Design a protein around this ligand. Structure first.
Ligand SMILES: NC(=O)N1CCN(C(=O)c2ccco2)CC1
Length: 119
């Protein structure tokens, strides 16, 4: 029933994601010299350094907000990919599966703790 536990749990999950080779394309923003049309396709860029920095600045109120930004990293990859078999998109799918598998208990525990708090 710890309402604040999600933050350290998210920090540790972000640490695991940064150790994963599949996250390399998603750690920093996309360079426009390499992908000139990126902002024509993607209106809201997002990356794992921005998520980690937002978390560490105390700018997420809940793990649901963090989850929305992480999911935006993956939807941006799906929207930008020219093919469903591309290397970078295929890395996003594995990383998304890993993230969803680990974030599930973080979300469940937070929502349960909040319900207990408001009982
Ligand atoms: N850091 C980068 O330069 N990226 C390249 C564009 N991105 C993609 O999701 C993507 C899908 C298919 C090909 O690239 C984000 C990562």
């Amino acid at each position: 029933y710890d309402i604040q536990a999600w933050k350290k749990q998210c920090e540790e999950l972000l640490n695991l994601i940064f150790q994963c080779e599949d996250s390399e394309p998603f750690r920093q923003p996309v360079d426009l010299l390499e992908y000139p049309d990126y902002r024509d396709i993607i209106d809201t860029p997002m990356d794992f350094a921005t998520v980690r920095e937002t978390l560490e600045a105390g700018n997420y109120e809940s793990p649901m907000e963090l989850c929305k930004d992480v999911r935006l990293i993956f939807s941006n990859s799906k929207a930008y990919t020219p093919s469903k078999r591309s290397r970078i998109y295929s890395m996003s799918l594995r990383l998304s599966a890993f993230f969803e598998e680990h974030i599930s208990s973080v979300l469940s525990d937070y929502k349960s703790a909040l319900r207990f708090h408001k009982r």
